[PDB]
Amino acid sequence: SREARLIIFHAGSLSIPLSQVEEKFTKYAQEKLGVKVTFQDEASGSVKAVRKVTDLKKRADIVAVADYTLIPQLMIPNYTDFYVLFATNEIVIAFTNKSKYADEMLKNPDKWYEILSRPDVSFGFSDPNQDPCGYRSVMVMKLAELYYGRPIFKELVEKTTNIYSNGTRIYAPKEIIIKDKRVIMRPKETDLVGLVESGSLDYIFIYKSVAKQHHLSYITLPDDINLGDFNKADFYGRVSITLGSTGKTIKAKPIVYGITVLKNAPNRELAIEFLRFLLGNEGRKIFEDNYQEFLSPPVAFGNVPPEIRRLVEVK
């Protein structure tokens, strides 16, 4: 095959570094594999990306998600038999100098929930049923309620939408309704960036890597609630969310991205070469430069391709 195409369904937060890795792989594929490669890339919230394969039965070679959990939970063994954990992230609150009370937010980051509770302030997060950034945002507000001892989840989520909780279990209905129009929602977190940049939306919950990639202002949240501290897994794990889209429950946990090549990938050998290139030195460098460093090393589970065995730790 001289000319080949790779179809990748992936998390929206991976868009920027993935696009750069794809560019470099195209050159590499020609020079080392003698193949002219083109990508049929489809960015969406990770839950939707997985469902496109498992429920809508669409064709794809590679699926890369922002929450590795989704792969063993929904794709194994029918669609794939392995997955690789390869990068991490944390949730931050992003904005720009045009956002209302931006200076105050920067100066008093610990009072972030008081500013978001103001009626004249608009904030957004992605759809929990489609995007891990969105279900993580809701979980972060629940952890915030538990951590600070203030009614943050009741104020920011239950008052503004029909997403609800009982104890530490959160429920995202199939049909989400926004009651307070100062709250904006979009299918994936990266859709929120344009809204903040234009100044029409004041604050957004989003990954630190995405905020830095788009040069947005942001404040960090406590490690006990931001999902970036691996030592807080037991505390994070007390909170969970049940998605209307899949009917399944996902626990809040340290953020770890996952990737896999499908059993019926149309260009499976080429897809595996791409995975080897991505987890290799060139991919690692590109992700580091986009503020999302790889795990050292990435960890792989299941029937791992021998081609990437020197690049991952098998479990």
UniProtKB/Swiss-Prot annotation:
UniProt-listed PROSITE patterns: PROKAR_LIPOPROTEIN
Bilayer topology term: Peripheral membrane protein
Matching CDD domains: PBP2_ModA_WtpA
Residues that coordinate or bind tungstate: G12, S13, S46, D131, P132, C133, E189, Y207
Pfam families per UniProt: SBP_bac_11
TM spans (from-to): none
UniProt subcellular location: Cell membrane
GO CC term (a single one): plasma membrane
Oligomeric and partner information: The complex is composed of two ATP-binding proteins (WtpC), two transmembrane proteins (WtpB) and a solute-binding protein (WtpA).
Annotated protein name in UniProt: Molybdate/tungstate-binding protein WtpA
Species of the source: Pyrococcus horikoshii (strain ATCC 700860 / DSM 12428 / JCM 9974 / NBRC 100139 / OT-3)
Gene: wtpA
